[PDB]
Amino acid sequence: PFFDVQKKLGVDLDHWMTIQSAEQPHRIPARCHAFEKEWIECAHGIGSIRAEKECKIEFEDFRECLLRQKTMKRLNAIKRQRDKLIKEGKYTPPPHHSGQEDLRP
Amino acid sequence: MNPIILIIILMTVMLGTIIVMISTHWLLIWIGFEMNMLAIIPIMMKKHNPRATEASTKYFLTQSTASMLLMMAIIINLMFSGQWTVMKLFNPMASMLMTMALAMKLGMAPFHFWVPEVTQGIPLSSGLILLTWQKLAPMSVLYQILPSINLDLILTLSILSITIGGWGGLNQTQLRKIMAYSSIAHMGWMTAVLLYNPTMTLLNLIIYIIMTSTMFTLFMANSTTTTLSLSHTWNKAPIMTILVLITLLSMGGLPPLSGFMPKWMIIQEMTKNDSIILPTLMAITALLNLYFYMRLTYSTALTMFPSTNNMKMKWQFPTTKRMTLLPTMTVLSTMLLPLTPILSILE
Amino acid sequence: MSLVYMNIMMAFTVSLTGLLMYRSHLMSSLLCLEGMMLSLFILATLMILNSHFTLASMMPIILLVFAACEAALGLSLLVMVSNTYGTDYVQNLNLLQC
Amino acid sequence: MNLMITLLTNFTLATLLVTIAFWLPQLNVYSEKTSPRLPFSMKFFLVAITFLLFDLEIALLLPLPWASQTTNLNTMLTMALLLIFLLAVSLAYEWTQKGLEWTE
Amino acid sequence: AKTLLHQYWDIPEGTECHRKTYAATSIGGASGLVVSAYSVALKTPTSFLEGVARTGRYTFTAAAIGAIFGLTSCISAQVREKPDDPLNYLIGGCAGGLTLGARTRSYGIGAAACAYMGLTAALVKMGQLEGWKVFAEPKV
Amino acid sequence: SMMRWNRERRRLQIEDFEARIALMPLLQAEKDRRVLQMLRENLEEEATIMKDVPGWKVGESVFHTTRWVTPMMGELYGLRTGEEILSSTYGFIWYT
Amino acid sequence: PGIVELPSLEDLKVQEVKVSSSVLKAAAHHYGAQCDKPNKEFMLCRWEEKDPRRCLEEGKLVNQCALEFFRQIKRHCAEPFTEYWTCIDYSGLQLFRRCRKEQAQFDKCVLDKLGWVRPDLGELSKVTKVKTDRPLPENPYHSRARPEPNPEVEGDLKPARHGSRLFFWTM
Amino acid sequence: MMTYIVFILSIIFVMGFVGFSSKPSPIYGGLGLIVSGGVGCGIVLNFGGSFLGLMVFLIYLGGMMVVFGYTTAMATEQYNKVVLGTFITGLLMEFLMVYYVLKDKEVEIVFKFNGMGDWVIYDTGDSGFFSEEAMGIAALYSYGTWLVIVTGWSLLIGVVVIMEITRGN
Amino acid sequence: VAAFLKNVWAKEPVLVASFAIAGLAVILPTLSPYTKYSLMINRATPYNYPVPLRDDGNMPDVPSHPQDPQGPSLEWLKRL
Ligand SMILES: CCCCCCCCCCCCCCCCCC(=O)OC[C@H](COP(=O)([O-])OC[C@H](O)COP(=O)([O-])OC[C@H](COC(=O)CCCCCCCCCCCCCCCCC)OC(=O)CCCCCCCCCCCCCCCCC)OC(=O)CCCCCCCCCCCCCCCCC
C-alpha cells in the first residue's frame, strides 16, 4: 500500500529531503554529490534487480565515498608502515612533514 | 470523551496511517507511526479504569521500543546508503532491525506478548481499531521493503506467529484474548507469503480485517466480552448466534466460506515456489485456530446454554446500538468465495 | 567506518538492554527509552554533519520533538499508573494475566 | 579550547568554594548535637507537561531569525505565523478545558 | 548455529562416529540452551541455583537426545551399510525418544517421543535426500 | 529607525559579500595549489615509505572512477604532525 | 583502480600573493573591477572542468594578474592604500563602514592616478559571460555507459485469454 | 591525545549509558542521563553542530529531563549487587573494546571500525558566510512545509491527548 | 458588535490587545507596499559566487564585465 498521492496530485511533500543531490539551500553540495548523482542516473528506471548488478561500480564508489573505509584502511597502512620504519630507524620524516617549512600561500 | 475531540483524534489516527502509506521519506514513516501511537493512546483509555491504564502503558512500551528500533534501522540505512527513500534497505542489519520493529508493531510472535493483554484491557471498539486499523501501516512498510527482508527471519516469525496464535486461544474464555491470538496467527499467515506474492498478503489483510470487524461488531452489538456472556445470545437475539456461527466458521478457513480464500491462495502461491513442507505445517497448525472457534460455536450457536430470569426484561427492548455495516461485513466475510479472482484488483 | 559510530551504536544497545531488562520502576524504563532517543539524535547528527547534507539538519530536531512528545505521553501514562497503584512499580501492572 | 579551559575554570572555582564551604566550618570542632508517599497534585504535572510541549513548539520556533533570510518568504511567513498560531491554539485549548486552573 | 548444522551434515553417514555424535550433541546443547534461556526468561526461578539447575537439566536433556540420536544413527548406518537410508534416522529418532522418556522419568512420553521424533528424523532424512525446502527461496 | 538601519545593514552586507566574491578566484587558485602541493608531498613520501610492502601500488585511487575526488582531511594531514592536524581539524570549532 | 595523476612540484610553483586578508579586503572592489577577465576564465574553467589539475594555467594567470594589480597599486598610491588597509585591519570583523574617509582618500587617489572606478552596489555579484578558447568538457563526471532501460509496453490491450485462469473460474 | 577528543567523549558517553542503564534508582538514572547528554552534546559540538548541541542543552536537558526529574520527585519516594555488577560488566566490555581497537587499529563488533581518531573523515573546505547546518535548519520553513504541518499538528494533538488522559474522567 | 467590543476591552484588555496584534500580524504584510522589497533584498544578497557563462555568441542580456550597463542592478536598493 504505497498509495503514491504525491505523484497523483503533483505535490512535493517529502521528495526534497530524500537524497543528497536534491535542491539545497544556498546551493550547498554534499560531500558525495557527484557519486550519488552518478549512482542515481545509473539506477534510474532500470529497476532494483538490474540496479543491484548493473550499478555495482557506482554504488561501491558512492558507499566508499560515504564511509571512506578503503581510504582510512589505506591511510592506516601508510601510517603503520611509517611508524614501523621510525621504530626500525630506516626512515626520518621530511621537513615538510615536521612543521618547519612555512606553508604555501 | 468529547465527541469533537473523539472525531479529531480518530482523524489523527487515520492521518498517521495515511502518512505511513503515502510518504516516500523514512522520517515521515517514523512520524506517521509516532502520530498513530500518540493519537490511539486516548482511544484505549476511553473508560478510565486501571486495566486500560495498564494496557495503554504496555502498548506504549512496546510501540515505543519498536519505533526506536525503526529509527535505528533508518539511521543505519542513512549510514550505508546516504539517502532516505522508502524502498529496499541497503544493509542486512538495518533489514533485521526494521523487520523486528515492524514485527513488534504488528505483535507477531515472539513479540506477541502485548497483544492479548492490551486487547483484553481496552474496550471492544478500541480493540477493533487496534486489531484492524493498526495492521495497515507496518504491512505497508513491509510491502515497501520486501527486496531486502531476510527470508529465514520473516518465515521464522511467521511460523512462530501461527503456532503461538494457535496454542494461545485454546486456553481462553475471554473474547478479546481469543481475537488477539487469532490476530497473531493471521499476521503469521500474512507475512509467510510476503516475499513470494504480496498481493496475497493484501488479500489476507483485507479478508482478515472484514472478518475481525464483523466479530467485534457482533461483540459490540451483543455487549458480550466472555464466552459465557456470549452464550446467552440465543435467548436475546437468535440471529446473532447464526452470524457468529457463520463468521467463526469463516475465520477457521472452512470452505465454502471466504475465510478459506486467503490461506488457500497463500498455499497456492507458496507451492509455486517449491515450498511444500511450510504451507503444510501452516495449514495443519490452522486447525488449532479452528478448534477454539468451534469451542465458541458450541458455546453460542450449536447448543443452548442456560440463561437467567432477568433476560425476560431484555426481551422487551430492541437493539438501539448503531450496528454499522454489520450485514455488509457479514455477507462479505462469508459469501465472497465465488468472487475469488477479484484478488487481481490488489495487484 | 568511523570509530565514534561504534560507540554511539553500543550506547544504543546498552540503553536497549537496559530498557529490555526491567528492575523495578517504570521511570527507569522511560529513562532508558530516552537514552535510546539520545543516541539516535547523536548518531543521526554525526552522519548528517559528516556528509554535509544540508536539508537533513532539520531531521534531528524533528526526531527530538516527536520523541519528547512521546516522552510526555509516557510520563502521563506513568502518572496514571502511579495514581492507581501508589507506586510506579511494574509488578503492580499484572492484572492482564487473566 | 578556550571555552573548555573556561568551563573547567568555572567548575574548579565552584568545586573549590564548595570544598571551603563544607570543610572550613569543620575545622572548629563544635558540640556533638545528639538531642532529638508524598501527596500528589495533577496540576504540577500538567504545568510540567504544558511547559514541555510549549518548549517543543519553541524548538520549532527557534530558527526564525535564520528563516527570515530565505527567498521563499510567502511560505516562510505562512509557516511562521502557522506555528505561532498552533502554539496559541494549544494555549486556547489548555484554557477552555480547565487545564490552567489553581495554577492558572 | 548454522555452522553447527554445516559441520553436522557434511560428514558422510556411518564413517566418523565420535565427530557426528559430538556435532549432534552440540546442536542439542545449543537448542537446550535456547529452551533454557526462554524458560528462565518467561518464568522466574526461585533463586540463582534453581535457575542454573533448570538450565543445566534442559541443556543436558537435549544434549543427551542429540548424542544418542547421532550415535544410534551412525551405529545403525554401520551395522546396516545403508548410508542414504531413512530407517537409520528412524532408529535414531526412536532412540532419542526413549532418551527423552528416560530424562523426563516417564514411559509413555518416551513411547510418543519415539514415534513422533522417529518420523520427524525420517522426514528430515528424506528432505536431505530429495532436497526438500522448508525456507524455500522465492523463484516465481 | 530599525527600518532605515537594517536596510543600510543589508547594503553593507552586500558590499562585504561582493568583496568576498571579488577575492574568491585568487583564494580558489591558492586552495587548488595548496591541496595539490600536499597531495604530491604525500605521494612522494608514500613512494619512499611503501617499498618494503609487497604488492603496494603507490597512488592507487580507491575509487573506480578517474574523476577528481575532493581530498579528505586524512589524505592531506595524515602524515603531518598533530599540532597542524588539530589546527586544521578543530581550529575553527575551538576558536573562541 | 587507476593511479591518480598529480602535477609535479614545478607545475605548482608560482610567485605568491604574500599579503594579508585585510590588504586583500581593502583593494577587493578594485581587484574585482580590474582583474575581472582572467579570474572569470579561471572560475569558469573551475566550475566546468571540476578538477583543479585542469586549471593550473588559469590559476597562474590569476596570480600574475593579481601581482600586476598590486604592483600597479604600489607604484602610484602606496601610502593612502597603507593608511586604508591599516584602518581596515584594526577592526576584528574588518568593517568597511568604519573606514569611509580612508576609503575616500584611496578611491580619490586611484581615480586620479590610475583611472580605476570602484564598482557600485550590485555590480560584482553579476553573472557575467566568459569568452574561452578551450573546448567544452564532454564528460566532466567521467560517467561511463548508462544501462539500457527496460522495454516499454506497446500494443492494444486485448482481453484476457479465457478469463482469470484461476483453477475453474471461467471469467 | 587531543586529536582523539570525540572518541574520549564517546567513551564517556558509553560509560554514562552503562551507568544509568544499570538503574540504581530513577533519580541517579536521571543524573546519569544528564551527564551522558552533556558529553554527547560535546560530541555533536565537536563536529560543528553548534545549534544542535544547544538544542540538546535547551530542549533535551533543558525541558525534557527537567520534566523527568520533576515527575521522579512527584511520583517516587526520595531514593545494589545487581546494579554495580552489571555496571562493572558493561565497563569491562567497553574497556575491552577500547583496548582491542587501540591495539589493532581495526575491530569488528557488528561492522568494521577504524582505530584512528575521527578527525580523518572531515572535509577540507569552507562554507563561506554561513553555516551549512544553520541554513539547513532555516530551511524548515521555506522547504519543509509539510514537515512543519505534521509536527505542529502532532504537538497540538499531544496537548489534546495529555489533557484527555490525565483528566481521569 | 461595538457593545461587545467595549465589554471585552473593559473586562479583558490583555486578550483584546493580543488578538489585535495577532490580527495585524496576519493581515498587514498582504497590504504593505514594502513586502515586495523584502523578497527583492533577500534574493539579491550574494551568498554564492556568480558562476559565469560560456560566451557562445548570443547573450545580449548577460554582461561581460561588472561595470557593464546590462545585467541586474541595485539602484532601487541604493535609493529606495
Ligand atoms: C442481451 C442482454 C440480456 C441477456 C440475458 C442473459 C441472461 C438471462 C438469464 C438472466 C439471469 C442470469 C443469471 C446468471 C447467468 C448464469 C450463471 C450460471 O448459472 O453460471 C453457471 C455456473 C458455472 O457453470 P457452467 O455450466 O460452467 O456455466 C454455464 C454458463 O456458461 C454460465 O455463464 P459463464 O460461463 O459466463 O459464467 C461465468 C462464471 C462461471 O462459473 C465458474 O467459472 C465456476 C465458479 C463459480 C463459483 C463457484 C464457487 C464455489 C465455492 C463457493 C460455493 C458457495 C455456495 C454455493 C451456493 C449455496 C447456496 C446459496 O460465473 C462465475 O464464476 C460467477 C460466480 C457464481 C455466480 C453465478 C450466477 C448467480 C446469479 C444469481 C444469484 C442467485 C444466488 C445463486 C446462489 C449463490 C452461489 C452461486 O454454475 C455454478 O457455478 C454453480 C453454482 C450455482 C450458479 C447460480 C445459478 C444462477 C441462477 C440461480 C437461480 C436460482 C436462485 C435461487 C435462490 C438463491 C439461492 C438460494
Ligand SMILES: CCCCCCCCCCCCCCCCCC(=O)OC[C@H](COP(=O)(O)OCCN)OC(=O)CCCCCCCCCCCCCCCCC
Ligand atoms: C484572528 C487573529 C489571530 C487569532 C489567533 C492568535 C491569537 C494570539 C494571542 C494568543 C491567545 C491565546 C489564548 C486565547 C484564549 C481565548 C479564550 C479565552 O481566554 O476565553 C476566556 C475569556 C474570559 O476569561 P475568563 O474565563 O473569565 O478568565 C478569567 C480571567 N479574568 O474570554 C474572553 O475574554 C474573550 C476572548 C475573545 C475575544 C477577544 C476579542 C479581541 C478583538 C480585538 C479586535 C479584533 C482583532 C482582529 C481579529 C479578530 C478577532 C475576533
